Design an enzyme around this catalytic site. Structure first.
Site, PDB file in Angstrom:
ATOM      1  N   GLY A 182       0.774  -1.238   0.000  1.00 34.93           N
ATOM      2  CA  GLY A 182       0.000   0.000   0.000  1.00 34.93           C
ATOM      3  C   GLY A 182       0.805   1.287   0.000  1.00 34.93           C
ATOM      4  O   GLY A 182       2.038   1.271   0.020  1.00 34.93           O
ATOM      5  N   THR A 183       0.081   2.403  -0.019  1.00 35.96           N
ATOM      6  CA  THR A 183       0.652   3.749  -0.046  1.00 35.96           C
ATOM      7  C   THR A 183       1.338   4.115   1.275  1.00 35.96           C
ATOM      8  O   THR A 183       0.870   3.739   2.348  1.00 35.96           O
ATOM      9  CB  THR A 183      -0.449   4.780  -0.387  1.00 35.96           C
ATOM     10  OG1 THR A 183      -0.639   4.825  -1.807  1.00 35.96           O
ATOM     11  CG2 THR A 183      -0.091   6.164   0.108  1.00 35.96           C
ATOM     12  N   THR A 184       2.445   4.850   1.182  1.00 38.92           N
ATOM     13  CA  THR A 184       3.197   5.289   2.363  1.00 38.92           C
ATOM     14  C   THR A 184       2.510   6.428   3.128  1.00 38.92           C
ATOM     15  O   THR A 184       2.028   7.394   2.531  1.00 38.92           O
ATOM     16  CB  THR A 184       4.664   5.659   2.016  1.00 38.92           C
ATOM     17  OG1 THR A 184       5.303   6.243   3.158  1.00 38.92           O
ATOM     18  CG2 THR A 184       4.739   6.632   0.838  1.00 38.92           C
ATOM     19  N   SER A 203      -2.317   2.669   5.953  1.00 39.04           N
ATOM     20  CA  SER A 203      -1.702   2.168   4.729  1.00 39.04           C
ATOM     21  C   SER A 203      -2.156   0.745   4.432  1.00 39.04           C
ATOM     22  O   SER A 203      -2.198  -0.099   5.328  1.00 39.04           O
ATOM     23  CB  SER A 203      -0.179   2.208   4.851  1.00 39.04           C
ATOM     24  OG  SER A 203       0.287   3.539   4.974  1.00 39.04           O
TER      25      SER A 203
END
Lengths: 242, 233, 250, 244, 198, 111, 241, 243, 244
Positions: I30-32, I75
């Site tokens: 996932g996104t940071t 996240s």
């Protein structure tokens, strides 16, 4: 093992797809919708000559303006007809009018995907989908004469002419050519008998085949063996001409 | 590898993927194409209806939720019926209890949470339908893309279904053009009709084939079918 | 959430064997040896206090437990499974009997109640059988002194003298030679210490051996005087000093 | 979920048989042999104790022959603990009938009710069936002396002479050989002991390995009396028949 | 309340039940049969609350007939009366009790003896040579205590009930429009159609 | 003891013509001897060419009209935008009223 | 608690649990039913694996649902009692509400409805029982004979057999039963019932039981001697040729 | 057949593998802990390891204050540790409300051990991969150490040890009580009992500690409390002036 | 053997819960997202991957508010994060209803902790596919927490999870070393922008949008507010200056 409501890698529900295979093993059911009425016909398919063919009930009445034909596991259709008869009558009680054919078909189709071991949504208490396809035909003041094909997938299509069962693929191709928007009630009667004769394993007569119609005037009526036999005789003579 | 972790939605894969969710997403790509797009005044849904036979009717793709909100479907129709019925109830709850028209953004949050509950518990399956929600509220025109995973994204333009990449590439290129179509509904429809035609491959869009819906500033959510979409052919 | 194990975890194998019962009986075989001997004027139950560490206090861990003032119990196998059964056995003595008849249950019926719980752990959904065999010794007015063995299957048998655990086979053979229907309570304790000596490997004293008796009424352990019919509990756990005094005359 | 660990107790085999029921019957075939014989003037129950020791207290022991009613008794083959669950429910059912109608429960009604409970675990619930085979011996004013049997499936049948447990095939052949319709209880007592002694897996049939019960209507009373034999009473009758 | 009378003679049980159904100000029916056949040799008469009276009677009738099919056997009049008593005993402590008084008139085929049972709405069963519910007994009992014998014939029992009805038709203010008389013996249950002027 | 009902007064009038229909009502809302409002709407347009007014207990009146308007809305959703006829509306209101038979709406409704 | 989906669809489109329930019927003892002009006759065979039964108290194969309707079965004996009990309750419930006893068609529809319910409910298996339901409608003299099966499918038959070796006896009935002229007498109707069973039973005077249902609640079961009289007569027909 | 190691059912050997693997989960944190009794006090020592510099040291704790009197040190993952902590706190509050007096140390241990037994027998509730050491000065028993495990087993201790190097600490404590011949640590003040507990932690592990490497919980009469970093620092100065 | 990773609550031979570790893989994909604790508050920041130009800027808000003082960012599976926040909002409302005072951050951390831990105890539920960074200002100072799929949480001076968690943690470690006295609210917002832009180097194939939120005692009166307008652009310009 595997969940009942599990999706395949292709994006289809296993149990629903396997249910369609059971309908392919069922007896042929043909419906033709015209501007004079909708004609429904089924194959009895008696397993033994000792079996009384008149007891075979594959054409049922939902309401005076709505009829039904079944194909596949016919025992699964009984509670579907029960729900349909309830929904039609309950609407009449609440609104002092007749239920629309499309609204009645939608109510039956809502039961289809209500299967699982505990699916998060409502209280869908059913181990497996219905193993039967229904041909719901009727008439209302809004959309006139209608013919629907209710699937165990929950989806329903409005057909001008539809065939379901063992010889469904061969029958639908024949209905594709024969159907036109100016067909009369009698022309549709001989047509159902013609295509049924082509897909049935046994020779078509008034015992192993049954007709039914739904009109605005008389409503839903099941054709007796004496009335059907005359139409088979008429269909035999017209095909003998050319 | 894949055969052991795709039995039910509750199971994670070693890579961290949910295959049952991914298979539900595959049901959308098999479904018919539908396009959504908006400006500052109006929001438009253009959908391609699919038939089984030439004797069958074209199955409806657009469902009305409220006087200001509606959505188009791609995939399983009964799953779209359940989710739209829930959205109809949530729009109804907001109007009865609060005398308030439900925000399209909040409507996307509600559809997200309902889809999530189907992905974390045993026995349940993910919804097999993608939805494109359009609406006009107190903040203007909106377009939201619903996915069975729960992911809902607010967009200027989007397309889901079979061959939907062609329509999505068009809207990405035409981005600056259709955004400024304000106070003119017909031209925004034409931008959507030209968008959905980029996804055509089997046949051309006809009279009983095309389905268009619009909601705007002084326009309630209305669906046009048959003769009403003949001028856009 | 929600228990989805609604089906039986114990099922019949093709051979007719109930696997989980057999494996529970195997767990009892691994357990420390416990024995019970019935005399003419009392019953004695004994076991070895197998200490996991010398830092651990053996006094806190009770392998022999009071069920009613007249009934005691000892076990072989899984410690935790025994402890919860004792809590259930004490509660069922009140809820199913004492709150109905105003008196404590007879040994045979309390055993029947414990056996019912252990039977249910074989048939009910989402559970395993108890990994213990129980030796229950008690007294009541109309049956006198009795000793019972309760197995993981829920089956129970009355015994004159028996043993369960590691060296049960060797202990039962020793008990058969030394038992007679004329034994006194003090004699029964003497055989109990002789039979248990063959099972214990390390130290053999009052701190490593747990022993209790079902015999005469104890007015000193009653806690109150006044009511003539109340004469005290018949269950008495022997102290470390009381065991050591009898070990000198071994 | 839990689907992985489900043995599926209530499903049919490709042949049409019920796995857990068939495997339960296999469990019964190892348990002690119980024989019931119906005579013109009473019923005889005889059972062989499985696994016995010298230090086993027989005087307070009850594992095979249980009393359900003042007129109805059972012989148990299989799991003793499973039987006591069913025995208790049959005792409640008998008293429920007596409370309702002010009459003692007819044997068949009690038998059918227990068989219906056995059937319940066979069709629904996902639980294992009761590994018990009963022999019902009872009396009512309708049919008189009756002998029934029930197995894990929930099926019950009426008998003149029947055996459950181990060596039933050998025991049934011996019973069919010596049984007649005009038998007396004293003759039925002898047949039951002779059949067991020939089908025993042990060296010799002794008193400490047997449970015996007779249900007779006393000629000097006019009422049906149940008699569960004491260890000494079994020892006496074993010598009289010619086994010693 | 309605007239519900019962008498047990030598070989039969005779039940007499009033024909009137009164609701408020009008007599709606003068030919009502306030009895139900539970089994070929057992008959039950009933009186009480307007709706409860027939609902309870048919409920018992359904249960006895269910037993008769299941066991292929007819329950003794004692066994039936005990079942009726327990149902009324359960009802008395429920949310809304059955306010129904019943008379069980049965012939035991095993004993070869007639039997009459009296149970009220509370669940009070009593075996009697003669019984009545409500105010019926106040006028009749003294005549029954005087003339009744255990060895009376069916004809004698009909004459005694006639005298009991004549007393009811004279002293009681309510017009109960006569009675329907039924005989329960070894041959089953028959109705006396000639009691209007016997 | 708390009384769940009240009287808000007012009077409504409905006359049916040959090809027309009128539903009138005063705009006065009251409690006992005090005027709550001199202008409080009582006759409402519910859609599908149907007008409704439930006079009596205003809280019950508002709830019934609100629940009927919602029933019309769902009639369009369930039956493909079909127009609700005046006889169909009448039967629908009966079930709305009889649903609370043992705790009734204290109103006299006219459509 | 337990709602595991036991009865489900297979790749080829069959419910195996329903399919294997029919296999249990194939294992069960043969049961035959024939209808004449004024009567219906049900015949069932008895097992010969163990012979020392008390015929008085042993539950018979033919069970009365009401005074006018009878039910015979093939398959698991324990499962049938559940269907018989529920049919008997429904028969009494119908008399209570409709004030008229059940028609044979209605009772058949109910039994088949119960069987169908067990084919798509979680945690249950289908009944391994097929039933033959015979009798007469109230105030009607027309013979009625119906058949149900585990799936829930029901239909009326002029002549039908179910159970073990049912394939052999069905072929016998197909070439012997005439629809143009049904057995006009009760005697000749019972004669055809025994003739059909003798093809399967293989000499069994005590192994054959006959139950005759007549109009207006007239059901009677034949004794061992009565059935044996037919067997003696039928065996003479073969020997005279 | 091979699912006997997946759920809490018996193996052919009569073992419960899920419980056995839950024991192995207790050493996942790589933390050693000991408990010793004074004359009128009870001291728990637990290793404090802060690997990440981004962590807040004050929050990294495996010692819990269950009640006013009872303290608990845990060996195993912190999610299961706080699960057992919240339950113990809830049970302690309920006992006081229902029975009018403070729950004893041994009773709480028995209750938590009974709960762990349920997870050992019933299938759907997994065993918590933690070992719980309860400490207090009981009003009847005095200084008390009671330890529970994933099996549902519980027993009293004169002194105890838990962790990966448990055996080394156990034998080290064993050898002291064989020499002293008395079950407790003969000292008036709790400070010197903490000093003893730290010293024997060093001798058994063979590792020197700083103020941030240790975590101390002290149980006295009517109070349990955890020491701060400066309190441990003061205690480390005293033992440094001895060696 | 094998198959320990197929079910949730099942322990593997090494005492591990693989289904939870598989959920961590979903977080890592996932996104940071990050969290910075300052001298009187906390600053949250998230990366927003621009998939297409069709996405409307400043609309798809990822950072969520609980009560009025707590901010949450996560996240991995975004819908799973929403489910956890929905529960957190219910738990915060339950605390305020009974105790009047708004829920303390250590109190709120445990409430989420127990809930996530509960989803690791059964085979019928799936573990959370999110690592949530959350915090705010309560009675005594500010708090910052990071919650793992296992239910494990700790207090943090700086928190980081997602795709570029390695680059973010390394940059956060520099801030703790260089600022022992404590970073300010203004500086933390500017720095939060710099952390993401450097952490974006692990996912630099796609364009991204910046989203910062903060809760400071002196700047926002201890309430959670989103960084908007001039202050947001000032942070972007600070990050774009030090990226080159």
């Amino acid at each position: 093992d595997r969940g009942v409501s599990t999706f395949s890698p292709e994006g289809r529900l296993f149990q629903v797809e396997y249910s369609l295979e059971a309908i392919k093993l069922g007896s042929t059911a043909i419906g033709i919708a015209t501007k004079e009425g909708v004609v429904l016909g089924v194959e009895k398919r008696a397993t033994s000559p000792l079996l009384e063919s008149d007891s075979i009930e594959k054409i049922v009445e939902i309401d005076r303006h709505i009829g039904c034909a079944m194909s596949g596991l016919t025992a699964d259709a009984r509670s579907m007809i029960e729900h349909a008869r309830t929904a039609a009558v309950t609407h009449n009680l609440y609104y002092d009018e007749d239920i629309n054919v499309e609204s009645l078909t939608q109510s039956v189709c809502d039961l289809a995907l209500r299967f699982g071991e505990g699916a998060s949504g409502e209280e869908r208490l059913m181990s497996r989908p219905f193993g039967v396809a229904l041909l719901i035909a009727g008439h209302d003041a809004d959309d006139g004469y209608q013919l629907f094909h209710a699937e165990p997938s929950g989806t329903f299509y409005r057909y001008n002419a539809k065939a379901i069962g063992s010889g469904s693929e061969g029958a639908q191709a024949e209905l594709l050519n024969e159907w036109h928007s100016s067909l009369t009630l009698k022309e549709a009667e001989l047509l159902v008998l013609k295509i049924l004769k082509q897909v049935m394993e046994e020779k078509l007569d008034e015992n192993n085949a049954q007709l039914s119609c739904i009109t605005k005037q008389d409503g839903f009526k099941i054709y007796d063996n004496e009335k059907t036999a005359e139409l088979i005789k008429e269909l035999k003579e017209k095909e003998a001409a050319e | 590898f894949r055969n052991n972790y795709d039995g039910d939605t509750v199971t994670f894969s070693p890579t961290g993927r949910l295959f049952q969710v991914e298979y539900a997403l595959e049901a959308i790509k098999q479904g018919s194409v539908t396009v959504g797009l908006r400006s500052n005044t109006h929001a438009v849904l253009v959908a391609l209806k699919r038939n089984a036979d030439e004797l069958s009717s074209y199955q409806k793709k657009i469902i009305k939720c409220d006087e200001h909100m509606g959505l188009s479907l791609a995939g399983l129709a009964p799953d779209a019926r359940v989710l739209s019925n829930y959205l109809r109830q949530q729009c109804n709850y907001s109007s009865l209890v609060f005398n308030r028209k439900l925000a399209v953004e909040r409507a996307g949050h509600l559809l997200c949470d309902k889809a999530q509950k189907n992905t974390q518990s045993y026995g349940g399956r993910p919804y097999g339908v993608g939805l494109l929600i359009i609406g006009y509220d107190k903040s203007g025109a909106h377009l939201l893309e619903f996915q069975p995973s729960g992911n809902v994204t607010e967009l200027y333009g989007t397309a889901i279904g079979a061959r939907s990449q062609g329509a999505k590439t068009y809207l990405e290129r035409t981005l600056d053009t259709f955004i400024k179509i304000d106070g003119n509904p017909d031209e925004l429809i034409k931008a959507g009709v030209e968008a959905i035609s980029q996804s055509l491959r089997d046949e051309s869009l006809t009279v009983d084939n095309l389905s268009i819906a619009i909601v705007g500033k002084d326009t309630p959510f209305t669906i046009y079918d048959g003769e009403a979409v003949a001028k856009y052919i | 959430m929600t228990d989805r194990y609604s089906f039986s975890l114990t099922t019949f194998s093709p051979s007719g064997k109930l696997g989980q019962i057999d494996y529970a009986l195997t767990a009892v075989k691994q357990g420390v040896t416990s024995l019970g001997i019935k005399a003419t004027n009392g019953v004695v139950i004994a076991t070895e206090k197998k200490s996991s560490s010398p830092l651990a206090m053996s006094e806190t861990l009770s392998k022999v437990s009071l069920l009613t003032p007249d009934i005691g119990a000892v076990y072989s196998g899984m410690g935790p499974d025994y402890r919860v059964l004792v809590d259930k056995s004490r509660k069922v003595a009140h809820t199913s009997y004492k709150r109905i008849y105003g008196e404590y249950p007879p040994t045979k019926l309390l055993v029947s109640e414990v056996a019912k719980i252990m039977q249910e752990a074989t048939q009910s959904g989402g559970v395993r059988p108890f990994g213990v065999s129980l030796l229950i010794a008690g007294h009541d007015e109309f049956n006198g002194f009795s000793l019972y063995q309760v197995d993981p299957s829920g089956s129970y048998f009355p015994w004159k003298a028996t043993a369960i655990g590691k060296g049960s086979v060797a202990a039962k053979t020793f008990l058969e030679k030394r038992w007679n229907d004329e034994l006194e309570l003090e004699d029964a304790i003497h055989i109990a210490l002789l039979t248990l000596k063959e099972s214990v490997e390390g130290e053999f004293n009052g701190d490593t051996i747990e022993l209790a008796i079902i015999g005469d009424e104890n007015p000193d352990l009653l806690g109150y005087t006044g009511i003539p019919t109340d004469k005290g509990p018949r269950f008495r756990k022997l102290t470390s000093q009381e065991i050591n005094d009898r070990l000198e005359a071994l | 979920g839990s689907r992985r660990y489900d043995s599926r107790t209530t499903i049919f085999s490709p042949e049409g048989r019920l796995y857990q029921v068939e495997y339960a019957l296999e469990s019964i075939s190892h348990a002690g042999t119980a024989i019931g014989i119906m005579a013109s003037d009473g019923i005889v129950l005889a059972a062989e104790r499985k696994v016995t020791s010298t230090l086993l207290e027989q005087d307070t022991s009850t594992e095979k022959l249980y009393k359900l009613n003042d007129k109805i008794a059972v012989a148990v083959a299989g799991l003793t603990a499973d039987a006591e669950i069913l025995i208790n429910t049959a005792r409640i059912h008998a008293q429920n009938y007596l409370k309702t109608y002010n009459e003692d429960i007819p044997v068949e009604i009690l038998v059918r009710r227990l068989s219906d409970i056995k059937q319940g675990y066979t069709q629904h619930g996902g639980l294992r069936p009761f590994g018990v085979s009963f022999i019902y011996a009872g009396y009512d004013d309708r049919y008189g002396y009756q002998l029934y049997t029930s197995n894990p499936s929930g099926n019950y049948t009426g008998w003149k002479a029947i055996s459950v447990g181990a060596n039933t095939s050998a025991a049934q052949t011996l019973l069919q050989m010596d049984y007649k319709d005009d038998m007396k209880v004293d003759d039925a007592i002898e047949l039951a002991l002779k059949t067991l002694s020939k089908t025993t897996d042990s060296s010799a049939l002794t008193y400490d390995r047997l449970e015996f019960a007779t249900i007779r209507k006393g000629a000097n009373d006019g009422e049906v009396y149940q008699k569960i034999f004491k260890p000494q009473e079994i020892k006496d009758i074993l010598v009289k028949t010619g086994i010693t | 309340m309605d007239i519900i009378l019962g008498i047990r003679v030598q070989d039969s049980v005779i039940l007499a039940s009033s024909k009137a159904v009164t609701r408020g100000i009008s007599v709606l029916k003068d030919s009502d049969d306030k009895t139900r056949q539970l089994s070929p040799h057992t008959l039950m008469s009933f009186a009480g609350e307007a709706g409860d009276t027939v609902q309870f009677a048919e409920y018992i009738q359904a249960n006895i007939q269910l037993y008769s099919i299941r066991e292929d056997y007819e329950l003794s009049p004692q066994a039936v009366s005990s079942f009726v008593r327990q149902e009324l005993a359960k009802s008395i402590r429920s949310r809304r009790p059955y306010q129904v008084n019943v008379l069980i008139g049965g012939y035991d085929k095993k004993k070869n003896k007639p039997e009459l049972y009296q149970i009220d709405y509370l669940g009070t069963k009593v075996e009697l040579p003669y019984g009545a519910h409500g105010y019926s007994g106040f006028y009749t009992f003294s005549l029954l205590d005087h003339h009744y014998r255990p060895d009376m014939t069916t004809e004698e029992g009909l004459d005694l009930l006639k005298l009991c009805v004549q007393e009811l038709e004279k002293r009681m203010p309510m017009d109960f429009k006569g009675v329907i008389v039924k005989i329960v013996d070894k041959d089953g249950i028959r109705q006396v159609d000639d009691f209007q002027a016997q | 003891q708390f009384n769940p009902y009240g009287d808000n007064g007012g009077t409504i009038l409905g006359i049916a013509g040959e090809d027309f229909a009128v539903l009138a009502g005063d705009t006065r809302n009251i409690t006992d001897y005090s005027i709550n409002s001199r202008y409080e709407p009582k006759v409402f347009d519910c859609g599908d060419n149907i007008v409704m007014s439930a006079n009596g207990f205003a809280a019950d009146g508002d709830a019934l009209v609100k629940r009927f308007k919602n029933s019309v809305k769902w009639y369009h959703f369930d039956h493909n935008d079909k127009k609700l006829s005046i006889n169909s509306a009448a039967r629908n209101i009966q079930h709305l009223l009889y649903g609370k038979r043992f705790f009734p709406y204290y109103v006299h409704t006219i459509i | 608690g337990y709602d595991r989906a036991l009865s489900i669809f297979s790749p080829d489109g069959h419910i195996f649990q329903v399919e294997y329930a029919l296999e249990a019927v194939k294992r069960g003892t043969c049961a035959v039913g024939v209808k004449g002009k004024n009567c219906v006759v049900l015949g069932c065979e008895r097992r010969s694996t163990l012979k020392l039964q008390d015929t008085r108290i042993t539950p018979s194969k033919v069970s009365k649902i009401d005074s006018h309707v009878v039910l015979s079965f093939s398959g698991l004996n324990a499962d049938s009692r559940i269907l018989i009990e529920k049919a008997r309750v429904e028969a009494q419930s119908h008399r209570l509400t409709l004030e008229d006893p059940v028609t044979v068609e209605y009772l058949t529809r109910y039994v088949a409805g119960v069987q169908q319910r067990y084919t798509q409910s979680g945690g249950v298996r289908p009944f391994g029982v097929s039933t033959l339901i015979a009798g007469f409608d109230p105030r009607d003299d027309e013979p009625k004979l119906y058949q149900t099966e585990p799936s829930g499918i029901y239909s009326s038959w002029s002549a039908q057999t179910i159970g073990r070796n049912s394939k052999t006896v069905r072929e016998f009935l197909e070439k012997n039963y005439d629809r143009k002229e049904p057995p006009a007498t009760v005697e000749e109707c019972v004669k055809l019932t025994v003739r059909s069973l003798l093809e399967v039973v293989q000499t069994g005077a005590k192994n054959i039981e006959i139950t005759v249902v007549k109009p207006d609640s007239d059901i009677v079961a034949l004794s061992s001697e009565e059935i044996n009289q037919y067997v003696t007569q039928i065996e003479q027909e073969k020997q005279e040729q | 057949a091979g699912y006997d190691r997946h759920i809490t059912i018996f193996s052919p050997e009569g073992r419960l593998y899920q419980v056995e693997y839950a024991f192995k989960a207790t050493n996942q944190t790589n933390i050693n802990s000991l408990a010793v009794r004074g004359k009128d006090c009870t001291v728990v020592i637990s290793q404090k390891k802060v690997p990440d510099k981004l962590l807040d040291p004050t929050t990294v704790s495996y010692i819990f204050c269950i009640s006013r009197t009872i303290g608990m040190v845990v060996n195993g993952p912190i999610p299961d540790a706080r699960n057992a902590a919240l339950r113990a706190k809830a049970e302690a509050a309920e006992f006081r409300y229902k029975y009018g007096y403070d729950m004893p140390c041994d009773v709480l241990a028995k209750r938590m051990a009974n709960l762990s037994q349920i997870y050992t027998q019933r299938a759907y509730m997994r065993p918590l991969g933690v070992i719980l050491t309860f400490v207090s000065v009981d009003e009847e028993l005095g200084p008390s150490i009671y330890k529970t495990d994933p099996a549902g087993y519980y027993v009293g201790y004169k002194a105890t040890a838990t962790g990966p190097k448990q055996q080394e600490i156990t034998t080290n404590l064993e050898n002291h009580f064989k020499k002293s011949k008395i079950d407790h640590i003969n000292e008036e003040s709790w400070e010197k009992v903490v000093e003893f507990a730290i010293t024997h932690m060093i001798d058994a592990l063979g590792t020197e500690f700083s103020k941030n490497d240790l975590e101390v919980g002290v149980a006295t009469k009517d109070k349990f409390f955890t020491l701060s970093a400066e309190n441990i620092e003061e205690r480390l100065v005293a033992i440094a002036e001895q060696d | 053997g094998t198959g320990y990773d197929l079910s949730n609550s099942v322990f593997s031979p090494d005492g591990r819960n693989f289904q939870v570790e598989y959920a961590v893989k979903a977080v890592e994909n996932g996104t940071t997202s990050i969290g910075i604790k300052c001298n009187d508050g906390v600053v949250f920041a998230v990366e927003k991957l621009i998939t297409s130009k069709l996405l409307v800027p400043q609309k798809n808000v990822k950072i969520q508010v609980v009560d009025r003082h707590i901010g949450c960012v996560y996240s991995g599976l975004i819908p799973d994060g929403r489910h956890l926040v929905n529960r957190g909002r219910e738990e915060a409302a339950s605390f305020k209803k009974l105790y009047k005072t708004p829920i303390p951050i250590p109190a709120f951390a445990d409430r989420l902790g127990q809930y996530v831990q509960a989803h690791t105890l059964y085979n019928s539920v799936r573990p959370f596919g999110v690592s949530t960074i959350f915090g705010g200002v309560d009675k005594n100072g500010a708090h910052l927490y990071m919650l793992e799929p296992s239910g494990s949480y700790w207090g943090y001076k700086g928190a980081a999870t997602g795709k570029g968690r390695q680059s973010a943690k390394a940059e956060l470690e520099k801030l703790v070393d260089h600022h022992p006295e404590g970073l300010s609210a203004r500086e933390a917002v500017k720095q939060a922008a710099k952390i993401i832009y450097l952490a974006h180097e692990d996912n630099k194939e796609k364009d991204f949008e910046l989203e910062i939120s903060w809760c400071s005692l002196s700047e926002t009166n201890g309430l959670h507010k989103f960084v908007k307008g001039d202050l947001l652009q000032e942070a972007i310009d600070f990050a774009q200056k030090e990226i080159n």
